[PDB]
Amino acid sequence: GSSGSSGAGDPGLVSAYGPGLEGGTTGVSSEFIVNTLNAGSGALSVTIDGPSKVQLDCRECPEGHVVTYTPMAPGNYLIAIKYGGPQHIVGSPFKAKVTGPRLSGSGPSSG
C-alpha cells in the first residue's frame, strides 16, 4: 500500500508513575499508571523480568494504562515500557527493587 508511517506516536511525551516501577515489598500487589494522554494515541508494550515470574494484569485507566503485579521473590524486576515505537519511552526501562522474604501464594488447601 501507499507509503506511510505505521501508526506514528510520541514516546517522549509518555511516562509511567507508581511504586511498581520503583519497587516496594514482597507479597505486596505493586502497580503503576502510564500517562500516555500527553502523547495522543498508540500501542503499549509492558513486560517484566526477574528472579521469579510475576503475575501482572494490564487494565484500562483514565490516566492511560495501568498494570498490577505481585512479587514472589526479593530482587530487581525489569519493567519495560514502550509506546508508538520499537524503542523504550523516556525514563524506561524501569528497575523495580522489591524487598522482603520470598512470598509465593498458590491457592487454598483446606476447606
Curated annotation (Swiss-Prot):
Filamin repeats: 8-98
Record localization: Cytoplasm; Membrane; Cytoplasm, Cytoskeleton; Cytoplasm, Myofibril, Sarcomere, Z line
UniProt PTM comment: Ubiquitinated by FBXL22, leading to proteasomal degradation.
Expressed in which tissues: Highly expressed in striated muscles. Weakly expressed in thyroid, fetal brain, fetal lung, retina, spinal cord and bone marrow. Not expressed in testis, pancreas, adrenal gland, placenta, liver and kidney.
Modification type Phosphoserine: residues: 92
S-S bridge residues: none
Highest taxon in the source lineage: Eukaryota
Additional comment: Silenced in MKN28 and MKN74 gastric cancer cell lines due to aberrant methylation of the gene.
Subunit structure: Homodimer; the filamin repeat 24 and the second hinge domain are important for dimer formation. Interacts with FLNB, INPPL1, ITGB1A, KCND2, MYOT, MYOZ1 and MYOZ3. Interacts with sarcoglycans SGCD and SGCG. Interacts (via filament repeats 17-18, 20-21 and 24) with USP25 (isoform USP25m only). Interacts with FBLIM1. Interacts with XIRP1; this interaction is mediated by filamin 20 repeat. Interacts with KY. Interacts with IGFN1. Interacts with MICALL2. Interacts with ANK3. Interacts with SYNPO2.
Disease tied to this protein: Myopathy, myofibrillar, 5: A form of myofibrillar myopathy, a group of chronic neuromuscular disorders characterized at ultrastructural level by disintegration of the sarcomeric Z disk and myofibrils, and replacement of the normal myofibrillar markings by small dense granules, or larger hyaline masses, or amorphous material. MFM5 is characterized by onset in adulthood, clinical features of a limb-girdle myopathy, and focal myofibrillar destruction. Myopathy, distal, 4: A slowly progressive muscular disorder characterized by distal muscle weakness and atrophy affecting the upper and lower limbs. Onset occurs around the third to fourth decades of life, and patients remain ambulatory even after long disease duration. Muscle biopsy shows non-specific changes with no evidence of rods, necrosis, or inflammation.
Function: Muscle-specific filamin, which plays a central role in sarcomere assembly and organization. Critical for normal myogenesis, it probably functions as a large actin-cross-linking protein with structural functions at the Z lines in muscle cells. May be involved in reorganizing the actin cytoskeleton in response to signaling events.
Family note: Belongs to the filamin family.
Protein name as annotated: Filamin-C
Gene transcribed to yield this protein: FLNC
Residues of the full protein shown: 2502 to 2599 of 2725
